[PDB]
Amino acid sequence: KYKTKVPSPVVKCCGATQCTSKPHPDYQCQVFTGVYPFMWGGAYCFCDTENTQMSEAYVERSEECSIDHAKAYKVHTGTVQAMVNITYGSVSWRSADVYVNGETPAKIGDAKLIIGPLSSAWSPFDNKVVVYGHEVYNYDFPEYGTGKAGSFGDLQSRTSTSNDLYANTNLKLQRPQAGIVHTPFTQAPSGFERWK
Amino acid sequence: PYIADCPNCGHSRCDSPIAIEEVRGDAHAGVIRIQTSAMFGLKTDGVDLAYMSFMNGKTQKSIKIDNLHVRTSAPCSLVSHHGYYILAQCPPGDTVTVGFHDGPNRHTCTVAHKVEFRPVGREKYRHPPEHGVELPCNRYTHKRADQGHYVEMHQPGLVADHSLLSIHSAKVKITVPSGAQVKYYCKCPDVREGITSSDHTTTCTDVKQCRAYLIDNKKWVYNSGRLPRGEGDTFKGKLHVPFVPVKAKCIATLAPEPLVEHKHRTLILHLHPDHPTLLTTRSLGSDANPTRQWIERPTTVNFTVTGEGLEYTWGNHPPKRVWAQ
Amino acid sequence: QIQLVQSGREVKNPGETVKISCKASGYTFTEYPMLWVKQAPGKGFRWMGLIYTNTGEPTYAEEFKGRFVFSLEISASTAYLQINNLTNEDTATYFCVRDYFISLDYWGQGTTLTVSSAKTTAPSVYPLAPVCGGTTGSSVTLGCLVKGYFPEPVTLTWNSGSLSSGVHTFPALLQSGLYTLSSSVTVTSNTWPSQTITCNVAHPASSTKVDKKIESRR
Amino acid sequence: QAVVTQESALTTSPGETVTLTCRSNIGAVTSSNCANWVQEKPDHFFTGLIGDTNNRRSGVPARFSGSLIGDKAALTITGAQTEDEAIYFCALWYNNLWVFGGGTKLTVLGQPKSSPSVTLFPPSSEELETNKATLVCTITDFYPGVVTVDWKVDGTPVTQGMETTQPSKQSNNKYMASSYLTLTARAWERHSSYSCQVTHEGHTVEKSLSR
């Protein structure tokens, strides 16, 4: 889930402050005029329409993104394993980890054993998978870079470290009301909020 | 201790020092991490986390925490404070409603935020019990020795203070806190920047047409949305967060055991939970044929078990398994 | 344990700059920042600001934002006050102080500045020996007169500082545009003139050092 | 933009309990003002006593305690001692800066009186080689710290030429002062009897030289 970690808006008191499209993820910024911002002393900007307010807000990974986070995957077939016990013959023991590919031995104990390949290639994982903590979902996640806001993957970071991401959150700033300092951020709660 | 604009500050939109931003009802353990714009913790100088520094005036007031109240639909329970930030064990609530008592006044602050507490588990409780299994919840720490993240905390912008703009018996008279930087002019033409000690105003007379400002950037702030930018620069002040979300194993849920009843390749199960419990199964044939249903109302259910087996998940109670030959 | 020892007192004509040092001892510099306080001759005590000896950020009192600049030789546990474009009404004493325990716990000795126009005159150092006749008691008082110098300060010791007990050094006073100072020392009558007693005077502004041994008048 | 106010002077006797207060012009003093108490002994000697209202600095006698009484910060000296005679300043924190009070001069009964030790020195000869002569009268170890110094050249009260410093506090808490009488090499050689008279707590001490 996102966090609309709003940078603190500019308030020019008499005249405009043009905004620029900073490279923050989903950097929504919209200049606003026609304010009279009550801040602790009543208003403070002495004009009345030239009072300008520039709201800016970008999307950022939550602190929970590091730890409580869904996780997509493109899943191929790989190679299956097993801790095969054989309490063999009179040997009476070997508990060894093996493979399935039909030329791999595993000389753990005394016996050499070749397994598979199995005929039952049903990977219960689908091609596309989402993963969450322990509950694994064979979900057709839309993709990195695309996820519709509100839908799953509104925030899409490659990894946790990745400062870049894709944040289609439909974050739309609105003008603050009646000459008061604040930042209307109108936004879909995450497609990670739903999906839980 | 920053001061911002609380939205429904008892009456209506005041400017409380405990103005609530970044409500996070995103964990599971009945807990919310909150940021006041007020920085409680140690005093102004050096002592005792359990004291209380908010802004009164331009000034702090680093005194005792005596009667804090976070609350929601019900009164919450504090967990710990550090910096601008408090952790508190709350129930669910449509809103969040915070406030201490200075002693002369209630002086609270309140806010909207959708809160819930699902515990982790297939049981949908409303509250953590005393018993049950432990399993990997998401939750915030008690502690402060914490660096797992840090939020930008650069300077404050100016602030209004019309207590400054007195009158010099005919002219409007600005003063200064301690030699702080007061940014000044009036609608008329007079002194145009203001980086001064206590000035007068030659031209204008009315207090209501002048720039009562306080560039007082000796201490940085949280970068609240309810902050005016310090226009000069992105000063330093990268500053940690205490209450990281951690992988605590909450003391957690458990649903009452089922009543297993045999039939021919069929489990009748008279069932009777405490709370809404997500039951589900997996007929282990390559035909999965699973089932899901939250059960809060006691219900006798049925499961066509096959020859090879079925499994059965009474909430976060462990999964069962069954031979029905 | 904790000692904040400050630089000695300066004289400076209007317009000049001064750097006052505060060398800290006994604590870990870094966990305790520094308060700079001005105690003006009449007026009493005033907070000039505080410096975060960890980050290095200064806070100035509004009265002090401008000509005043705090800095620190971190490395040597020194904090410094610099007052630029000295105004005549900056004569006063400045103290460094440690902020700790929800207040200030230790104060320095003070560095006194006397902003004042004047050239540089070296002092004349005169020995003060007892009257020509007798002078017989259990003890004896000698003296040293440091006359006619500018500007402040002068330092005075007795026998390179090994003789400090029984010494009275008298604060310098301005007379006819020049400073005059004096000191007395009292020792047992067996010590002097048996053992040598010497007045040591330094006037940094003129690079003058004078050692004057007190000799008997006959 | 706040004014801390303190009693101007307080006088007590050894063994008594005395309270100094610290008032804020903006409102009651509270624990978030972190009242500090600082003591100034003679010689520009500062030490911190209490901080954060009631935390006693380490190595400050226990006779000293701080608290909030009513709407002000207070310092109580329980069993005041002679050694406690000094100037006490309070400091209050106001969210971003410190404001110091004017200080309270406290006087404590003790230190039995002590007569001055007066010495008059003749102009040295290296100085008479400058065509100048300065008679130095030194007065030390006197208490109470108030004296009258009068010079008398040849029986006649000099009235011009003399300069007397202000009593300065020594370490033991007694005072000192010196007086100078500057003549010319010549004025020197003219007159014949010089005398420095010091009046202290009623007794007089005259130290005369003879050229």
Author numbering:
A (entry chain A): 50 to 245
B (entry chain B): 501 to 825
C (entry chain C): 1 to 218
D (entry chain D): 501 to 711
From the paper:
Here, we report a 4.4-Å cryoelectron microscopy (cryo-EM) structure of eastern equine encephalitis virus (EEEV), an alphavirus that causes fatal encephalitis in humans. The icosahedral shell of alphaviruses consists of an outer layer of trans-membrane envelope E1 and E2 proteins and an inner capsid layer separated by a host-derived membrane. Alphaviruses utilize the E2 protein for attachment to incompletely characterized receptors (Schwartz and Albert, 2010, Zhang et al., 2018). Endosome acidification triggers conformational changes in the E1 and E2 proteins that generate the fusogenic conformation of the E1 protein (Gibbons et al., 2004, Haag et al., 2002).
The binding footprints of Fab fragments of five neutralizing mAbs (EEEV-3, EEEV-5, EEEV-42, EEEV-58, and EEEV-69) were mapped using cryo-EM structures. EEEV-5, EEEV-42, and EEEV-58 Fabs bound to domain A of E2 utilizing primarily polar interactions. EEEV-5 and EEEV-42 Fabs interacted with Lys71 and Lys74, two of the three HS binding residues (Gardner et al., 2011), whereas EEEV-58 interacted only with Lys74 of the three HS binding residues. These three Fabs also make a few interactions with residues in domain B and the β-connector. The EEEV-5 Fab had the lowest average occupancy of 45%, whereas the EEEV-58 Fab had the highest average occupancy of 97%. A Fab bound to domain A in a radial orientation will clash with Fabs bound to the other two symmetry-related positions on the same trimeric spike lowering average Fab occupancy. This is consistent with the low occupancy of the approximately radially binding EEEV-5 Fab and with the higher occupancy of the more tangentially binding EEEV-58 Fab. Differences in the occupancies of Fabs that have similar orientations can be attributed to variations in the paratope sequence and Fab affinity for the epitope. This may be the case for EEEV-42 and EEEV-58 Fabs that have similar orientations but different occupancies. Here, it seems likely that mAbs whose Fabs bind to E2 domain A cause intraspike cross-linking due to the presence of three symmetry-related copies of domain A near the 3-fold axis of the trimeric spikes.
